Amino acid sequence: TSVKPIFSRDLNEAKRRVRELYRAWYREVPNTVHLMQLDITVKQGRDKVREMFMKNAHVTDPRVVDLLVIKGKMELQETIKVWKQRTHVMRFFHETETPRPKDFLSKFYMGHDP
């Protein structure tokens, strides 16, 4: 309570910027799979976009949302340009990491971790 803002009087005016950013990403994906010759389909790129958006849907602080929008604009800059290579983009997909088992008994069969 009683804190300063950044770019957002409220959460709805932040969701506005969120949707602008989702839009820019949706319109950028077909150009990134083309310019640097990715070996994916546009469908799953945009699904990755929505996944990495819904990775942070629990948040309600406007300030956190604005900072996430800022970092999304940074990544979008890096991706619109080719400052980052196929390696960095396909880093999102985790095309080599085996799935962390989300089950008790598997974790018990391998490892002491919870």
Partner 1 sequence: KRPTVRPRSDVTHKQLSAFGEYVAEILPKYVQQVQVSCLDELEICIHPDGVIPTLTFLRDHTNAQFKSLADLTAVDVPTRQNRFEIVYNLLSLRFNSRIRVKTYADELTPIDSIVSVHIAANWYEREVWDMFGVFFFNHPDLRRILTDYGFEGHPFRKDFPLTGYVELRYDDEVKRVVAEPVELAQEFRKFDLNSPWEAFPAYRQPP
Partner 2 sequence: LHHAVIPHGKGGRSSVSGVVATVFGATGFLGRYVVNHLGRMGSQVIIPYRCDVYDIMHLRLMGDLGQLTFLEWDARDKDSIRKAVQHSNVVINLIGREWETRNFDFEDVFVNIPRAIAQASKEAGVERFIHVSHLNASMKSSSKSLRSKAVGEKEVRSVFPEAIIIRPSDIFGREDRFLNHFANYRWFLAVPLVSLGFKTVKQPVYVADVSKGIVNATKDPDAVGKTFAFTGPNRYLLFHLVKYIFGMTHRTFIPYPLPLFVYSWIGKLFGLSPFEPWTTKDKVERIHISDVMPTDLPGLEDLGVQPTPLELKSIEVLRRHRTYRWLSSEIEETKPAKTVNY
Binding site for partner 2 (CB under 8 A): 33-35, 37, 39-42, 96, 98, 110-111, 113
Q: How far is the CB of 34 from partner 2 (least distance, A)?
A: 6
**Does residue 26 contact residue 78 with C-beta atoms inside 8 Å?**
no
Q: Which does 84 bind (CB under 5 to 8 A by kind): partner 1, partner 2, none?
A: partner 1
Task: Burial-class residue 12 by CB neighbours within 10 Å (0-12, 13-18, 19+).
Answer: exposed
Other CB atoms within 10 A of residue 7 CB: 14
Q: Which does 67 bind (CB under 5 to 8 A by kind): partner 2, partner 1, none?
A: partner 1
Nearer to partner 1 among residue 34 and residue 70 (C-beta)? 70
Phi, psi (rounded to 5 degrees) for 111: 110, 160
Q: Which does 34 bind (CB under 5 to 8 A by kind): partner 1, partner 2, none?
A: partner 2
